[PDB]
Design a protein around this ligand. Structure first.
Ligand SMILES: *[C@@H]1O[C@H](CO)[C@@H](O[C@@H]2O[C@H](CO)[C@@H](O[C@@H]3O[C@H](CO[C@H]4O[C@H](CO[C@H]5O[C@H](CO)[C@@H](O)[C@H](O)[C@@H]5O[C@H]5O[C@H](CO)[C@@H](O)[C@H](O)[C@@H]5O)[C@@H](O)[C@H](O[C@H]5O[C@H](CO)[C@@H](O)[C@H](O)[C@@H]5O)[C@@H]4O)[C@@H](O)[C@H](O[C@H]4O[C@H](CO)[C@@H](O)[C@H](O)[C@@H]4O[C@H]4O[C@H](CO)[C@@H](O)[C@H](O)[C@@H]4O[C@H]4O[C@H](CO)[C@@H](O)[C@H](O)[C@@H]4O)[C@@H]3O)[C@H](O)[C@H]2NC(C)=O)[C@H](O)[C@H]1NC(C)=O
Ligand SMILES: *[C@@H]1O[C@H](CO)[C@@H](O[C@@H]2O[C@H](CO)[C@@H](O)[C@H](O)[C@H]2NC(C)=O)[C@H](O)[C@H]1NC(C)=O
Ligand SMILES: *[C@@H]1O[C@H](CO)[C@@H](O)[C@H](O)[C@H]1NC(C)=O
Lengths: 130, 49, 208
């Protein structure tokens, strides 16, 4: 029921602020989690970061020093800024919605559980070249 | 890797605590109120089961 | 990187997942075609989203010790794509990288004779010429392109792309021969030869 549409500049100069936007037409942006993945050529696709429904961010430790993800409230859109991009940040960026499931193997009070995430709905993908 | 722990049924413990306090009241009075708390301190073998 | 797997048409396949878990797991199985939108096949080891056919399945960890294998019954041509195995367990932390890409290949497909078409330069008004040789609807995607000026080979200015799959599950490729208009009008005719397996197809075109 959710359609995702990516929109990016495609080309960014080195050492700048790469900015991409993901437009959602299905539902509200404050109900499900959202995340960014990049398929780089010659490599496996990389998960870079995500943003929750409660507006809290998490980033990949390799790119946590350079990435930031934002969510618009009036517009049904989510933006991703990447500061100081280099020749290695060229990839096909896919925005994807995500669901938080928790897997429990013991007693709830003791802890012994962990949160796992899965991206059911993806976008078509926007290519970004540096 | 989990945590070692011990269970006890809650209702049976409540009932046995009640029958303990009913006899405790035989040497301190029916009206005096008594309570139960954990250990006050000391060595490890004293403050724990 | 990517690791290959080869399966026969119609038989059941069991894709093995690397970096197997150390504790209780809720794995994810993703099917990714090159360049398209990736689509997950499994989000919870047994559970699948609405719309996924029953052919794909994942192993639940009913007893600690089972490995995550993606089992596919009745493999068809459309299943040929990369497969990523996202691994989540209790003993490990946040798994950022997905599993190693698994290049599934579907063997024993029906081979197709290459459909070849040669186009002479249009562009001559712009003082440039590019002979364009296109190959469509052939399998397997392994072809060789040779250019011929009358009878002598060209071997210069040739730019050829690697075969890429199309919607027919066959392959498509293109070759460009860049030449000056004077050299195009010089030689009598130009022949593009496409060699597919043991067969060879030659197409000849000449200036008017
Ligand atoms: C001393 O006191 C202690 C405390 O009082 C006490 O501690 C207890 O210890 C035991 C074990 O030592 C603990 O038991 C464990 O319980 C775990 C949790 O189980 C509960 O939750 C699941 C999952 O619920 C989700 O899914 C259902 C649908 O399936 C939804 O309806 C739920 O709402 C929920 O999903 C939503 O919510 C999630 C969280 O928000 C979201 O993420 C999600 O997206 C959804 O939104 C239920 O299924 C369980 O129900 C079962 O149990 C009830 C009784 O409670 C029965 O009626 C019936 O049998 C139900 O089936 C339950 O409610 C278990 O996960 C755990 O067992 C798994 O882990 C072990 C260890 O790794 C595995 O070896 C084992 O095989 C189990 O794996 C199965 O489940 C996982 C999870 O999906 C699968 O991935 C896996 O493949 C396998 O599935 C297979 O079996 C399924 C059926 O079981 C089958 O359907 C599948 O198809 C597949 O074949 C373990 O049993 C217990 O929690 C502790 N107590 C407390 C309070 O925590 C101790 O025992 C006492 N005694 C002592 C110490 O001596
Ligand atoms: C402690 O464990 C024992 C056995 O592991 C539990 O006793 C069993 O209780 C069930 C009730 O569901 C009976 O059907 C079994 O016959 C009992 N076993 C025996 C050996 O008597 C007991 O309930 C557990 N107590 C707690 C507090 O967890
Ligand atoms: C406390 O209650 C008991 C009833 O079991 C009664 O016999 C006893 O006299 C009471 N003691 C006082 C001080 O009221």
């Amino acid at each position: 029921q959710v359609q995702l549409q990516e929109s990016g500049p495609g080309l960014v100069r080195p050492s700048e602020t790469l900015s991409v936007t993901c437009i959602v037409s299905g539902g509200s942006i404050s109900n499900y989690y959202w995340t960014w993945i990049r398929q780089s050529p010659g490599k496996g696709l990389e998960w870079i970061g995500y943003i929750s429904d409660r507006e809290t961010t998490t980033y990949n430790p390799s790119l946590n020093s350079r990435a930031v993800i934002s969510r618009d409230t009036s517009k049904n859109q989510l933006s991703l800024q990447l500061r100081s991009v280099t020749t290695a940040d060229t990839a096909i960026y896919f925005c994807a919605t995500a669901r938080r499931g928790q897997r429990i193997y013991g007693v709830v009070s003791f802890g012994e559980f962990f949160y796992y995430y899965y991206m059911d709905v993806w976008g078509k993908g926007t290519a970004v070249t540096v | 890797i989990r945590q070692a722990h011990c269970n006890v049924s809650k209702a049976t413990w409540n009932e046995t605590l009640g029958k303990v306090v009913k006899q405790l009241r035989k040497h301190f009075g029916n009206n005096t109120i008594i309570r139960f708390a954990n250990s006050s301190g000391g060595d490890l073998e004293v403050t724990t089961h | 990187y990517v690791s290959p797997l080869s399966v026969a048409l119609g038989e059941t396949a069991r894709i093995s997942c690397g970096r197997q878990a150390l504790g209780s797991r809720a794995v994810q199985w993703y099917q990714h075609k090159p360049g398209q939108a990736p689509i997950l096949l499994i989000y919870n080891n047994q559970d699948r989203p609405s719309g996924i056919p029953e052919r794909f399945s994942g192993t639940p960890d009913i007893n600690f010790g089972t490995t995550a294998t993606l089992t596919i019954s009745g493999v068809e041509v459309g299943d040929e794509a990369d497969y990523y195995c996202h691994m989540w367990d209790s003993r490990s932390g946040f798994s950022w990288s997905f599993g190693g890409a698994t290049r599934l290949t579907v063997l024993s497909q029906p081979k197709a004779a290459p459909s070849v078409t040669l186009f002479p330069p249009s562009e001559l008004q712009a003082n440039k010429a590019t002979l364009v040789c296109l190959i469509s609807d052939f399998y397997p995607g392994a072809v060789t392109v040779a250019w011929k000026a009358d009878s002598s080979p060209v071997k210069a200015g040739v730019e050829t792309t690697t075969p890429s799959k199309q919607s027919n599950n066959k392959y498509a490729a293109s070759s460009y021969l860049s030449l000056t208009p004077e050299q195009w009008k010089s030689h009598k005719s130009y022949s593009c030869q496409v060699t597919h397996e043991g067969s060879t197809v030659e197409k000849t075109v000449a200036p008017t």
